[PDB]
Amino acid sequence: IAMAALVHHSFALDKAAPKPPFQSHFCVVSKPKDCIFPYAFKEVIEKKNVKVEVAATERTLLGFFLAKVHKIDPDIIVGHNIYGFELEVLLQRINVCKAPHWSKIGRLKRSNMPKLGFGERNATCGRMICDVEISAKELIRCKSYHLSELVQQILKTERVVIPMENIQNMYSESSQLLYLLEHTWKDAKFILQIMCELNVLPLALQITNIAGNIMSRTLMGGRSERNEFLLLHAFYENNYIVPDKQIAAYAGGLVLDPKVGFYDKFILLLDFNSLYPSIIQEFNICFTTVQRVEQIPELPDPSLEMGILPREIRKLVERRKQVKQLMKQQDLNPDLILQYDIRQKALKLTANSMYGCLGFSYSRFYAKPLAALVTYKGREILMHTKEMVQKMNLEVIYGDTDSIMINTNSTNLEEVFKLGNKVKSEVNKLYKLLEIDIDGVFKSLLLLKKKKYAALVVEPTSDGNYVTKQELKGLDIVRRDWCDLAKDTGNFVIGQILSDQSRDTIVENIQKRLIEIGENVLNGSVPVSQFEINKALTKDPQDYPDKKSLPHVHVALWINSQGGRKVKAGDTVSYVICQDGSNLTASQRAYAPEQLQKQDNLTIDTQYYLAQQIHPVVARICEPIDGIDAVLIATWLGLDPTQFRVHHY
Amino acid sequence: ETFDPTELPELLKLYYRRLFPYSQYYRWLNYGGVIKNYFQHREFSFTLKDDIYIRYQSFNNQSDLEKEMQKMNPYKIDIGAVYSHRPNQHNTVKLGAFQAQEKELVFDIDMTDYDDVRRCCSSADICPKCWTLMTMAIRIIDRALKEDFGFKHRLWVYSGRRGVHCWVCDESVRKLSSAVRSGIVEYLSLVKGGQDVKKKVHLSEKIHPFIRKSINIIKKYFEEYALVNQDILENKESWDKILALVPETIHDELQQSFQKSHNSLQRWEHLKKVASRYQNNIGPWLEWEIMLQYCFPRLDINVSKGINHLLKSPFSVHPKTGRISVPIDLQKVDQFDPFTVPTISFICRELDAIRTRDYKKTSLAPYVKVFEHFLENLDKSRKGELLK
Amino acid sequence: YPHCLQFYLQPPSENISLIEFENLAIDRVKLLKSVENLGVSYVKGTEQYQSKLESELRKLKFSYRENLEDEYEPRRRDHISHFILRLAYCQSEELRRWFIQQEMDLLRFRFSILPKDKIQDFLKDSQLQFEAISDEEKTLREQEIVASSPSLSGLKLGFESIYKIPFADALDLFRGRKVYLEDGFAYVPLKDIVAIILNEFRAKLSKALALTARSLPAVQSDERLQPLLNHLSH
Ligand SMILES: Nc1ncnc2c1ncn2[C@H]1C[C@H](O)[C@@H](COP(=O)(O)OP(=O)(O)OP(=O)(O)O)O1
Numbered sequence A: 001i002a003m004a005a006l007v008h009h010s011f012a013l014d015k016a017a018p019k020p021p022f023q024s025h026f027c028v029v030s031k032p033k034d035c036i037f038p039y040a041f042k043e044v045i046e047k048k049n050v051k052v053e054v055a056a057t058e059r060t061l062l063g064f065f066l067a068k069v070h071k072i073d074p075d076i077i078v079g080h081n082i083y084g085f086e087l088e089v090l091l092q093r094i095n096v097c098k099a100p101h102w103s104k105i106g107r108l109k110r111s112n113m114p115k116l117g118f119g120e121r122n123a124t125c126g127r128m129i130c131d132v133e134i135s136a137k138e139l140i141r142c143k144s145y146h147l148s149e150l151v152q153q154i155l156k157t158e159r160v161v162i163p164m165e166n167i168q169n170m171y172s173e174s175s176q177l178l179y180l181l182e183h184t185w186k187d188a189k190f191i192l193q194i195m196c197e198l199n200v201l202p203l204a205l206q207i208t209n210i211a212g213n214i215m216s217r218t219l220m221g222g223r224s225e226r227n228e229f230l231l232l233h234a235f236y237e238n239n240y241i242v243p244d245k246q247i248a249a250y251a252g253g254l255v256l257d258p259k260v261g262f263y264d265k266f267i268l269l270l271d272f273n274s275l276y277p278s279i280i281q282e283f284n285i286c287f288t289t290v291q292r293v294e295q296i297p298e299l300p301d302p303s304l305e306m307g308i309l310p311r312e313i314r315k316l317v318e319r320r321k322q323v324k325q326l327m328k329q330q331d332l333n334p335d336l337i338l339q340y341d342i343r344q345k346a347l348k349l350t351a352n353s354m355y356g357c358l359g360f361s362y363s364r365f366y367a368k369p370l371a372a373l374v375t376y377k378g379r380e381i382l383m384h385t386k387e388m389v390q391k392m393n394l395e396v397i398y399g400d401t402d403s404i405m406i407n408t409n410s411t412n413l414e415e416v417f418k419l420g421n422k423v424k425s426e427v428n429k430l431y432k433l434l435e436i437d438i439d440g441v442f443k444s445l446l447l448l449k450k451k452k453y454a455a456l457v458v459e460p461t462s463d464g465n466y467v468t469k470q471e472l473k474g475l476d477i478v479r480r481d482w483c484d485l486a487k488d489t490g491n492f493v494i495g496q497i498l499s500d501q502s503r504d505t506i507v508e509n510i511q512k513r514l515i516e517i518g519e520n521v522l523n524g525s526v527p528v529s530q531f532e533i534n535k536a537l538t539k540d541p542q543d544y545p546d547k548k549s550l551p552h553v554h555v556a557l558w559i560n561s562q563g564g565r566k567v568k569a570g571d572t573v574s575y576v577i578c579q580d581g582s583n584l585t586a587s588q589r590a591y592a593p594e595q596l597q598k599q600d601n602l603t604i605d606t607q608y609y610l611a612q613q614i615h616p617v618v619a620r621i622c623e624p625i626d627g628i629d630a631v632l633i634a635t636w637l638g639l640d641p642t643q644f645r646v647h648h649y
Numbered sequence B: 001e002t003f004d005p006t007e008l009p010e011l012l013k014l015y016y017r018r019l020f021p022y023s024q025y026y027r028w029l030n031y032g033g034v035i036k037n038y039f040q041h042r043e044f045s046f047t048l049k050d051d052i053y054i055r056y057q058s059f060n061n062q063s064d065l066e067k068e069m070q071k072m073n074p075y076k077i078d079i080g081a082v083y084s085h086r087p088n089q090h091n092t093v094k095l096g097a098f099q100a101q102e103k104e105l106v107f108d109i110d111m112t113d114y115d116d117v118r119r120c121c122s123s124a125d126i127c128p129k130c131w132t133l134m135t136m137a138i139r140i141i142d143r144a145l146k147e148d149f150g151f152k153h154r155l156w157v158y159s160g161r162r163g164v165h166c167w168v169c170d171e172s173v174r175k176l177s178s179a180v181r182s183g184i185v186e187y188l189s190l191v192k193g194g195q196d197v198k199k200k201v202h203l204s205e206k207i208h209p210f211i212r213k214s215i216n217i218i219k220k221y222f223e224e225y226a227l228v229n230q231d232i233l234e235n236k237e238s239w240d241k242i243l244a245l246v247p248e249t250i251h252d253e254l255q256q257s258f259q260k261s262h263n264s265l266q267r268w269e270h271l272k273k274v275a276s277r278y279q280n281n282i283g284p285w286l287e288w289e290i291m292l293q294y295c296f297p298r299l300d301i302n303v304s305k306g307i308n309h310l311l312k313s314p315f316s317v318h319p320k321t322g323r324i325s326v327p328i329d330l331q332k333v334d335q336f337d338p339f340t341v342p343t344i345s346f347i348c349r350e351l352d353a354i355r356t357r358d359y360k361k362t363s364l365a366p367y368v369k370v371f372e373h374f375l376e377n378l379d380k381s382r383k384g385e386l387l388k
Numbered sequence C: 001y002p003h004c005l006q007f008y009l010q011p012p013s014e015n016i017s018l019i020e021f022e023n024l025a026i027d028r029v030k031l032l033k034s035v036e037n038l039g040v041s042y043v044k045g046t047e048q049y050q051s052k053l054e055s056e057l058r059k060l061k062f063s064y065r066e067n068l069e070d071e072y073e074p075r076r077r078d079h080i081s082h083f084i085l086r087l088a089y090c091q092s093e094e095l096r097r098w099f100i101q102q103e104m105d106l107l108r109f110r111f112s113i114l115p116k117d118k119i120q121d122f123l124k125d126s127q128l129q130f131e132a133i134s135d136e137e138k139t140l141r142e143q144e145i146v147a148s149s150p151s152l153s154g155l156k157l158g159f160e161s162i163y164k165i166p167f168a169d170a171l172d173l174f175r176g177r178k179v180y181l182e183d184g185f186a187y188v189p190l191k192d193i194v195a196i197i198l199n200e201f202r203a204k205l206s207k208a209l210a211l212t213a214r215s216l217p218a219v220q221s222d223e224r225l226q227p228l229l230n231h232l233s234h
């Protein structure tokens, strides 16, 4: 019914985004069928001076769009969910309504069009298509990948949502149609602003100029194709013959056994810079140099020259080092530093995907022994370094395949820096290209299990003064499958435990805060939006054989079967557990967020959110600390202790 | 004269500058300074340009209420509930320590609830000849909140286009829980409007006093409004809907009774006679059902049941009608002319053709003297309760 | 002081032997269990129900009709028994409802046996702030009350007294348009006051039970009370 577009004619790919981002715009609106436009709409259109064209039927609207795109002749079309729903809707409408000259949507003349990113890319020949969803998923990690969450996070602005049901009601007044049109225009502006802020186009151009593939394939994501073309260019340049196209499996990293508990003294953390590429460059690991046929091959002779693989990975490493030097500069704009961080993360992922493509069974350059050898050498390096650091009368408490955590047990900063420098020199003396650096110095650290620890990182400012920043790794507070209530309570508990107060006061503070939470949850003063659980779907909702026992797919079939926009693979679903009164299990009582404020018989299940959402997080967090137990938390929250542990009378 | 919306942005700067009664608006909401931050915890909502609806705003004193809102110039102002903390700092408050504590008892009457009885105007507009139905509502509720419940401090304000709001602000009323508000709303509700059901008023032989004194009041205005002014018994589709409420067994006699007459007065007389004849041989109080279903006040549950629900503040300017929301004089409710209510354009014209008492030189003085009387009366209870 | 029915607040401060400590708990459990049988096997109005329940109350030395002054011992027995039983039946949610239902039934029985005229002082002795009306006031509003009456048949305003209550406390009544409201005060028949008394007792009982459960770990530290807190459903 409504389509709005914005156009810029001098967008530069070798310079920052233009300000303002747009120079032209237009919009078209049409009536559905049975209804009619509210009267005096033309007079209001002339009054407000809006570049809007009113059409008679849908066919005229399609003709207007296909005629306008020819005159504008865009080269990059950016949108949201273009590859999933929008383009299919447009193409199917063209076919069913018999629009003229569909080949105007691309840049080539054709006769018959295929249907279902293969079909879309074929139908849009000659024009790049950019989807903010794919690029955002590739560059930034968020909780949900809809338009609202992206606008909330990237742009820091709230966006109004118009439901499907209310569309019929707003056909009565001219102002309501104007509001709909303005909302569509605002959505287009938000999409353009997100694209300009993420700097998607320069990164895509740089990656395509590095790998050498086609630019349109870069914007669709995926890491195998770039590596395939990169290795193809590398081998063709040196007069080779490449394999023809096709018409767990090996040992990985080593993680040390941790020492669970709480640490008040300073902790050093030593980390390797670009471990696996450094190994490849160090031991001349390449296709030409290593013999092959689950067996680990032997290292090659050191006299032979460098192979194809390390020379190509060296360039990526050097580019990342170049970006970090620019990052080092002082007095930089806050947005520029984030753009550089995204750039270096993308380059790091490109460098580390070259190793991953060696173990992909469908890759054009599949070679298991090479990955097995690099993993074996990584494990050997980790073990040797751990032995050498233990030899110096020092303690190691954790390490994950490239890192070592040392408990210095001191309290002065200068000496711990000196010890870190000494160990750094001792480690770096052995190897040629590999290097080790002090990633950070911790103040207080709570280590729960493997890959689970919270800490305070010491950030120096000037003249020996230092601040502390809280960081988390692997806890339940950083995952998307837990309610915001439990995450906030866990964050409060972590903040209390890691403080400098006495161990006596923290228990009392936790008790008071837990009692307040227990009262407030039953009272009902907490908003509904904090009871949501978000889960991602891997397969299509109709394809799940166990649909009954899984809550999120159960909500997904409902939202597909009654609602509008259809959720597909990769999308996220939000569900809340409520009281139905049918005496089924908790996992079979999931309901949509909009299903609670519309119906009357449903109410929030406080027992589930108070005995299975809050309690497990605070019970797992406070395990290494004394004075707090599961039964005490159960009593504090107002629960029945009989379930958790009790038993003996 | 017709109000011009296009000049609304220009006049709004002047009205908020020299006409808005700031002193009494602050003295009312501060409630005598007895409570430690009773004003600083109040939620105001402002409707700015471009249809921007911002919800949480707070103020520190009179000076902030002056300068902050002068720099904004909102189209509409709404007053919320007194929250536990300052509403503008709601982002940083604790997880669940933010909840409402007190609010006045608000009652809203909307003209759109009388669409199935109305035969003259549109759903969104009014005419003089039917506006009396509004007063027929007030005298039913005004008595009910005065004698039955004993509430003393009530303010009746013109909504601006199609209703009158009632604020109850007695000291005990402001702290009532939601259940008591729902109950007091139910006690005043009689017309059970279903899914477009013809019959919406039901009763038994036993008569509650609240539903009998209401009949005693409605009898005074029924003959003037329904039988002469409304004249709902003139042609076939005028009394077919009336007969729909009546059991079909009497339609045969009633059609012949209404057929040979000329105006609604004898229509009502014959209808009463036949209804009494039906009662004698069979009670259901047929003659009262039609009056109660055509004329009893209807209230919205949603506007009043909640504790944090926003409502338009007095002395605001409606974007369309331009009329200032003015209080009603309780002792001359029958002497109120809706179309006499001054417009922002008219008062601005008066001000242009002219310690700050410039509202006294404008026609707004008689309509703010009632506000001053309300505050003076409330101060009487203030000093009679605490000091005695 | 009206030791024949009492809202249980102001926990006691006396000290007792442990044998009496266990005997009080077991006797209260026995009586409260037999209330279940009496309420299940019979109906709430037969003379046999009253006779059996009062005979059992006499058997276990528990308070009943107030016409014989100094039964201080049954008063003390019941006062200690309720508080000692509060600790046990506050653990599981299947036992809290069982406690509340049968205690409310017992209070209903104790209320039904007050003769006619000691009720007024009791209402003031439980912090309830209720009032009665004289005969002249009853005659003044006779027609108004009988018109405001519920589906109760007949216009005869019997000898049952009419009570005067703040309106906010009669939410369950004036919501249904079944009472008379005047000057912010509700007028109710004596039959319906039982419902509001029990409804207001229930909330306080539940609040007391909840506040005891969370401060009950401190009491488990005593080694002499472990058998009692775990073997009252054994
Ligand atoms: N996304 C990934 N895909 C494939 N391999 C990965 C990925 N992330 C990490 N690895 C492997 C290869 C890396 O050499 C090794 C250690 O990674 P990590 O500690 O994140 O950084 P890094 O050692 O490459 O250096 P840097 O600290 O400079 O980013 O783990």
Ligand SMILES: [Mg+2]
Binding pocket: A271, A272, A273, A274, A275, A402
């Ligand atoms: Mg590293």
Ligand SMILES: [Zn+2]
Binding pocket: B120, B121, B126, B127, B128, B129, B130, B131
């Ligand atoms: Zn009218």
